[PDB]
């Protein structure tokens, strides 16, 4: 596997949340999420990544006019993450195109960009079913210019991304731009969509972003319907005009149809197998790119939930993939119920992991009181390997074999170690002091 790298050249293992669905409907475009909430997340789980929801409606409230005050608010939030050592992926999020699909249900595009052409959008028993209503299908068909009537929409979209990238190009905490949440092709589905207008939009948007930001990873998703459930993607390679090596990453989601016992469990397990094979294939097509699992999640109160969650994280680890769990929002899917009570997720996610490795991590494992990591060395890297250790399992000092301890910060929970680069692959083993 391939990895995103920090400015020190260290390979990043990214663990965090989507933050947050509450931003979708907020007049000011911000999530119901405070700096204190982030402090809690970090204290409880030691996360180092966020998929932070932004929106086209908030960036470009009128055609060609970008809201710099909205971008100020996003920058403020990114600052909270920066202060606690997080890396940020900005997600241009939509579901069912826009809030403008009914006089609420959807989110994303501004009203001026929403052309349903008077076609109906009748109430449906599940939010996902709004995708196939005539007005929503038309809204997307117009956006992709399948209708031939709105070539301007993708152009506006690309330049709205350019505006965001112009603001965040020199932001040390931002590592990735996730160009579109769950692309939906309307009347176009499969390879016709993904290799056609979807790829074309990604290319135009990448090109626009690269007018103002040369180093942030541009993250592209397959179409969500089908691919979320373990079907292959027909997405094609996107060219990165930046000088030097490509910085494109692949950011699919994982949502098995059964969702965890009986035949449902078997179906979900083979879904993971299928999803892994397809994800690896498309990551190769795109240029042997890094993978970020941009969303997965479920109601943690379902029997078998922990086993599913642990299997997904094991699979991500084996694939060298980042993970942003859906989502930090209050409720049984998330780490906290509305009153602040921890769900099963906190203890499940709160495990040691390498955050930033001085070399390629070839394999690693962890339990509550042990971490082992093997590193393919890189003599050019001078920064130490940086590792999270939860206080539950590591209440005092550390015992490290295979590396020299550089620092052990018992407050931030960050262990830093140093390994040789001229001795082949190095295995580091971390256990609690006796
Ligand atoms: O349904 C859970 C999530 C979904 O959030 C869901 O979006 C819906 C529509 O905005 C909201 O009503 C829900 O409150 C929210 O949890 C993600 O926006 C989407 O990318 C996805 N794909 C699969 C699952 N999910
Ligand atoms: Na409109
Ligand atoms: Na950056």
Automatic annotation (TrEMBL):
<feature type="disulfide bond">
    <location>
        <begin position="219"/>
        <end position="251"/>
    </location>
</feature>
<keyword id="KW-0378">Hydrolase</keyword>
<keyword id="KW-0326">Glycosidase</keyword>
<protein>
    <submittedName>
        <fullName>Endoglycoceramidase II</fullName>
        <ecNumber>3.2.1.123</ecNumber>
    </submittedName>
</protein>
């Amino acid at each position: 596997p391939s990895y995103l790298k920090d400015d020190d050249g260290r390979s990043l293992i990214l663990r965090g949340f989507n933050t947050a669905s509450s931003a979708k409907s907020a007049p000011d475009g911000m999530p119901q999420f405070t700096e204190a909430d982030l402090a809690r997340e970090y204290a409880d789980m030691g996360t180092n990544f966020v998929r932070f929801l932004i929106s086209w409606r908030s960036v470009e409230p009128a055609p060609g006019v970008y809201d710099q005050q909205y971008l100020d608010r996003v920058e403020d939030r990114v600052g909270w993450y920066a202060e606690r050592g997080y890396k940020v992926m900005l997600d241009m999020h939509q579901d069912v195109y826009s809030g403008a699909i009914t006089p609420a249900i959807g989110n994303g595009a501004p009203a001026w960009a929403t052309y349903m052409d008077g076609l109906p959008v009748e109430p449906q028993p599940r939010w996902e079913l709004y995708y196939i209503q005539p007005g929503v299908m038309r809204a997307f068909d117009n956006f992709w210019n399948t209708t031939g009537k709105h070539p301007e929409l993708v152009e506006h979209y690309a330049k709205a991304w350019r505006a965001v990238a112009d603001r965040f190009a020199d932001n040390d905490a931002v590592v990735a731009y996730d160009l579109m949440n769950e692309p939906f092709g309307g009347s176009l589905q499969g390879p016709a969509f993904e290799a056609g207008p979807l790829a074309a939009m990604y290319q135009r948007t990448t090109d626009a972003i690269r007018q103002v930001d040369q180093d942030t990873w541009v993250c592209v998703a397959p179409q969500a319907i089908g691919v979320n459930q373990g079907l292959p993607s027909g997405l094609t390679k996107i060219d990165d005009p930046r000088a030097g090596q490509q910085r494109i990453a692949y950011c699919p989601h994982l949502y098995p149809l059964p969702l965890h016992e009986g035949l449902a469990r078997t179906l979900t397990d083979v879904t993971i197998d299928a999803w892994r094979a397809n994800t690896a294939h498309t990551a190769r097509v795109l240029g042997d790119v890094p993978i970020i699992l941009g969303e997965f999640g479920l109601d943690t109160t379902l029997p078998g939930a922990r086993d599913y969650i642990e299997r997904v994280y094991g699979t991500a680890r084996e694939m060298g993939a980042g993970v942003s769990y859906w989502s930090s929002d209050p409720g049984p899917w998330g780490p906290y119920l509305p009153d602040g009570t921890q769900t099963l997720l906190v203890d499940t996610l709160n495990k040691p992991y390498p955050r930033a490795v001085a070399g390629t991590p070839t394999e690693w494992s962890s339990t509550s009181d042990r971490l082992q990591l093997t590193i393919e060395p890189d003599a050019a890297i001078t920064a130490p390997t940086e590792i999270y250790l939860p206080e539950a399992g590591f209440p005092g000092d550390v015992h490290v074999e295979g590396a020299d301890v550089v620092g052990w910060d018992r407050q931030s929970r960050l262990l830093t170690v140093r390994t040789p680069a001229d001795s082949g692959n190095v295995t580091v083993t971390v256990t609690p002091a006796a």
